[PDB]
Ligand SMILES: CN1CCc2nc(C(=O)Nc3ccccc3NC(=O)c3cc4cc(Cl)ccc4[nH]3)sc2C1
């Protein structure tokens with residue numbers, strides 16, 4: 001995250017972190033339930049083997065609340081395309097169940113029609129992660145969050161040098177230097193409704209980070225609700 | 234605005250229009266309250282709540 005604020009204690013409890021063999025984070029995920037993590041399909045090609053860390057806010061130090069979970073099943077969308085990052089979504093089933101506690105809790109899945117007319121028509125959603133703090137910099141050792149405006153589909157088509165499919169939506173700022181960035185990929189975009197947070201997006205891609213006249217591109221979760229439901233069995 | 238377009242039909246969470254009336258429902262882990270509008274968490278750590 002470029003700009004934004006730290007997640008304070010208990011503020012971003014649905015955040016998960018994919019960690020490589022070297023125990024370093026390379027992508028985010030969202031906790032959907034005790035066995036299932038939502039992430040981006042493209043994240044699956046960035047580590048041969050990986051695990052899931054939950055409950056972490058500061059990767060510099062184990063503060064006792066952290067837990068690691070191995071992945072039993074990977075379920076990647078069959079139509080994912082490296083070319084365009086269309087269908088950039090995967091679900092992970094964990095070998096052992098997550099224990100919910102301070103800083104570890106799932107985000108809600110909404111119903112599709114209500115989500116589209118009610119959540120995605122709100123001003124802003126919230127994105128979070130341990131990604132880069134600047135386009136060229138290193139990954140944050142602290143969990144950050146950022147409020148990002150939903151962006152008009154048309155404005156976003158015009159801003160983009162790559163195709164924006166109907167499986168994507170745009171969020172972020174025109175010029176203001178705030179955005180997700182590399183390493184945030186896979187993580188939650190959630191929309192608050194009356195003090196309840198629903199998952200609305202997966203951090204997918206952007207042309208650099210926080211560039212002027214550019215936006216962040218997110219997988220549109222509402223397009224995949226049935227697929228997710230099926231995948232969770 | 235009417236029904237669900239009017240302050241979410243007074244529902245806490247999901248609002249649907251069935252016939253010409255509001256029907257509220259809730260995410261998994263919540264139950265609909267007696268008034269048919271509020272969603273009551275059934276356990277600790279319901280989805281979508283920051284942890285206290
Ligand atoms: C169709 N494509 C798929 C992947 C892609 N990656 C691109 C690219 O330009 N990456 C990049 C190269 C160097 C440094 C940073 C980044 N950005 C990123 O990694 C990045 C991911 C991301 C997600 C959100 Cl929601 C908002 C901003 C973002 N920036 S352009 C592009 C187009």
Ligand SMILES: [Ca+2]
Pocket residue numbers: 056057058059060061062063066
């Ligand atoms: Ca830690």
Ligand SMILES: [Ca+2]
Pocket residue numbers: 172173174175176210211212213214215
């Ligand atoms: Ca921008």
